[PDB]
Amino acid sequence: PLEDQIGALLGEHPRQIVPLAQVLRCHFQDGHSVIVKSFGEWDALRFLAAHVPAIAPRPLARSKDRRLVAMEDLRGETLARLLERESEAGARRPLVRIADALGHLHGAQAPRVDGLPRALRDEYRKQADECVALRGKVRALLGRAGVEPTPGFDGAWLELVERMGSPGPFLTFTHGDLAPSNVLLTDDGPRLLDFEYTGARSALYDVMFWEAVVPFPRSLARPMTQAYRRALASHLPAARDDARFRRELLTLKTHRFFWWLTFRLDEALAGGDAHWVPGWRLRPAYLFYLQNYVSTARRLGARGPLLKTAQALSSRLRRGWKERAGYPDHFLGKLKPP
């Protein structure tokens, strides 16, 4: 019985267990609660237990067979709830606060990554290796889209792989799955939840959170990245160099774009009744991701075969589809169209 196992684990018995790889909210007395997951997160949380200002749940206990993990139950407002109710003007301060916290996480932890478990330490090498086979997936997808990769594509891809395998001084602790549902605004500042995908990666990998993944207007992504970089560069000298920072940003944006193209572009090519998420139809979403990459990549000085191939895909689909890049419903009020 799970109540008894958790009781044994914590040395006190929960009065009530509420289900949210099962995530459980366990209630005790006087409003005390714990999160229990019943089956890298543990080692990630241990690694961060002394990082200040605190940003992650404290690990509390783990069974001997490691199938029960108890951790601090951080409570607050999810970023998701915040973006659903707020305006652009009103979201900016918490968003900047989140970006600064993450910059201090990446900066403070970069010299300490030898202390992560081997599998987490190697994550960037695994993903660099995967990026080799990603080229073929992308090529075949462009075949199904009826778009020819532009000249020099393979040679530009090789260099992207090389850049992805050499994070160099940007190599640090990364959360790896940042999302609006697992970032919290609390009375004591930003907090992160759900460290399952932690790994040693380029710092800029996590920055894709607001730079590419969540469809922020550029009037919010840019000041987030500016705040992030100020906090990061206070730790890491390499981030004071505009050309090196901009290069790292472009490297990870390019990887993120071509990676996420392979996820569901075929669904968008086949029909038009699908959604990226309930409030965001799949074609306006992929048109958003296409234009946002092309536009922001050019602002970063991009001009090689990978951009041109993205440009050719964006043109094909803008014309072939007749839908429009758009923002999700119930996201930062009524936004100017992208």
Name the residue among 317, 218, 254, 279 with its Cα closest to residue 80.
279
**Residue 78 φ then ψ, to 5°:** -70, 150
254, HSE (Cβ side, Cα atoms, 13 Å): 31
The CA-based diameter of the chain, rounded to the nearest angstrom, is 66
Method for structure elucidation = X-ray
Report whether 56 contacts 304 (CB < 8 A): no
Residue 248, token pair as written in the block: 């790292």
Six token digits for residue 310: 């993205």
| Residue among 78, 105, 55, 92 nearest 216 (CA) | 92
242-270 vs 305-321: helix crossing angle, rounded to 10: 30
Instruction: Give the integer Cα–Cα distance in Å for 328 and 326.
Output: 7
Residue 22 lies in a domain: no
Question: What whole-number distance in Å separates Cα of residue 192 and Cα of residue 288?
Answer: 27
In order, the DSSP letters of 46-90 are HHHTT-SS--SPPEEEE-TTS-EEEEE---SEEHHHHHHH--HHH
Contacts of 247 (CB under 8 A, 6+ apart): 163
Q: How far is CA 65 from the centre of its chain?
A: 30
The C-alpha angle 29, 32, 36, rounded to 5 degrees, equals 110
Distance CA 335, CA 322 (A): 20
d(CA 200, CA 118): 10
160 Cβ neighbours under 8 A, 6+ residues apart: 131, 251, 254, 255, 306
Boundaries of domain holding 103: 78-325
User: DSSP labels for 250-316?
Assistant: HHHHHHHHHHHHHHHHHHHHH-S--EEETTEEHHHHHHHHHHHHHHHHHHTT--SHHHHHHHHHHHH
Instruction: State the Cα torsion 7-10-16-19 to the nearest 10°.
Output: -110
In sequence order, what are the residues at sequence separation of 6 or more whose Cβ sits closer than 8 angstroms to the Cβ of residue 23? 35, 36, 37
For the CA atoms of 290, 296, 299, 302, the dihedral, rounded to the nearest 10 degrees, stands at: -60
What residues contact 111, with CB distance under 8 A and at least 6 apart? Answer: none
Question: From residue 296, how far is each of 117, 160, 196, 304, 307 by CA, in Å?
Answer: 35, 17, 30, 14, 11
**Residue 37 is assigned to a structural domain of this protein:** no
User: What resolution in Å is listed for this PDB structure?
Assistant: 2.1
DSSP per residue, 132-200: HHHHHHHHHHHHHTT-PPPTTHHHHHHHHHHHHT--GGGEEEE-S---GGGEEEETTEEEE---TT-EE
Q: Which two tokens stand for residue 214?
A: 């969540």
Q: Element (H or E) spanning 10, and its range? A: helix 2-10
Inside any domain, residue 40: no
SS3 category, 206: helix
Q: Looking at residue 262, which CATH number applies to its domain?
A: 3.90.1200.10
In the chain, the amino acid numbered 210 is W
Domain membership flag for residue 313: yes
Please tell me whether the peptide bond between 19 and the residue prior to it is cis, using omega within 30 degrees of 0: no
- Residue 69, in any domain of the structure: no
Give CA separation, 11 vs 24, 61, 69, in Å: 17, 10, 14
Q: What tokens appear for 106 in the block?
A: 């990446």
249 within 8 A of 208, measured Cβ to Cβ? no
Give residues after which the chain gaps, C-N over 2.5 angstroms. 20, 39
Exposure class string for 1-32: b at 16+ Cβ within 10 A, else e: eeeeebeebbeeebeebeeeeeebbbeeeeee
Whether 45 is in a domain gets the answer no
How many domains does the chain contain in total? Answer: 1
Q: For residues 64-86, b (16+ Cβ closer than 10 Å) or e, as one string?
A: eeeebbbbbbbebebbeebbbeb
CB 70 within 8 A of CB 23: no
| HEC readout, 80-140 | HHHHHHCCHHHHHHHHHHHHHHHHHHHHHHHHHHHHCCHHHHCHHHHHHHHHHHHHHHHHH
301 occurs within a structural domain? yes
User: 198-207 as b/e, with b when 16 or more CB fall inside 10 Å?
Assistant: bbbbbbbbbb
For residues 165-177, b (16+ Cβ closer than 10 Å) or e, as one string? eebeebbbbbbbe
Contact of 206 with 199, CB cutoff 8 Å: no
Asked if the structure places residue 205 within a domain, the reply is yes
Cα-based distances in Å from 32 to 19, 23, 75, 212, 306: 16, 17, 11, 37, 52
Helix 305-321 × helix 282-299 angle, to 10°: 150
